Design a protein around this ligand. Sequence first.
Ligand SMILES: CC(C)Cn1c(=O)n(C)c(=O)c2nc[nH]c21
Ligand SMILES: CC(C)Cn1c(=O)n(C)c(=O)c2nc[nH]c21
Ligand SMILES: CC(C)Cn1c(=O)n(C)c(=O)c2nc[nH]c21
Ligand SMILES: [Mg+2]
Ligand SMILES: [Zn+2]
Lengths: 17, 323
Amino acid sequence: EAFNHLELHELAQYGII
Amino acid sequence: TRELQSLAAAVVPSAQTLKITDFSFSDFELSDLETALCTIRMFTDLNLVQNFQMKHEVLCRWILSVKKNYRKNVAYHNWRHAFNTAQCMFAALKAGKIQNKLTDLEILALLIAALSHDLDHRGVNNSYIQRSEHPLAQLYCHSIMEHHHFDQCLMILNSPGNQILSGLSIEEYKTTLKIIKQAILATDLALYIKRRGEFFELIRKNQFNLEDPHQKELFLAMLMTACDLSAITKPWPIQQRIAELVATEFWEQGDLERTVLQQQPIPMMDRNKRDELPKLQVGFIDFVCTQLYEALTHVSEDCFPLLDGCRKNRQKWQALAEQ
Ligand SMILES: CC(C)Cn1c(=O)n(C)c(=O)c2nc[nH]c21
Ligand SMILES: CC(C)Cn1c(=O)n(C)c(=O)c2nc[nH]c21
Ligand SMILES: CC(C)Cn1c(=O)n(C)c(=O)c2nc[nH]c21
Ligand SMILES: [Mg+2]
Ligand SMILES: [Zn+2]
């Protein structure tokens, strides 16, 4: 589950990754 | 076993009767037996039953089996979710008019997939099971839960008197299963994100075209996601209530996170923050949903009700977020 580091916060604050 | 007796002998009402052709459809008032019946009507009216030599007896057992393999104690991710998804999926192909755009092998696969995309879901996200070192995480690499949901689907199809696929040539069977795997995996939100960009552009640039083998199977992923969270496109009173279940299940996980994991849960699963629900809903709809249902309508106009109902709920959550 490797995504662009800019995405990471939004991704996590929703249940994803 | 009597459940099978009673089911495999009841009349399956028409799709009109069952209002399963509707994007605005609700299960709240249906019994268990009724939902199974709808399912059968689904398979029937998609011609799956006749074109693949399915025996009423077998299909019934199978359906029942899937039903019993969703956990009752689990708040949102129970059988009624698999069911509401498959009905959305069904509505998409009929009223949304997509059937006319893909093969019988694909339709069968989508339906079977939609039904079992969350089998044995234990009310907890991929993130959690990974971070808690569940043995399932040791077993599977990426898309952990979704790999499991499929391991299950397949286990059931190989069960005796459940081979609803028994009628398929070995080549058919072989590729159906391939598509089903792809479908179930696609319901991993992480893949939806790591792939949707691609697809949003072919749309944007008026370049998107089904004929293209690859362009198609991408879209098939996008369609899965589309139905998997169709709940967000429901009339307010329904969206209201189903958001109540997602709510609880999340909070239930949040509890585990600070009780066994000793970490702080994201706010979305932080039971205490129940008053920040609506904005969290808004941000999610913005981030995940509108984006996608828009796309889907460009592909098929008759699928607009989904987009309409979506932004309509976004409207009402936003209002609430402002108390
Ligand atoms: C395609 C299929 C032969 C592979 N396959 C699989 O992936 N899972 C998870 C099973 O449980 C299974 N059982 C038989 N074949 C299986
Ligand atoms: C490869 C074959 C012997 C196994 N097999 C199977 O297990 N199921 C469930 C089917 O529906 C099927 N159709 C063809 N072969 C099948
Ligand atoms: C499975 C779940 C994480 C997806 N999902 C969903 O389907 N609906 C309807 C929501 O409102 C929601 N909010 C977060 N995730 C959500
Ligand atoms: Mg899933
Ligand atoms: Zn799901």
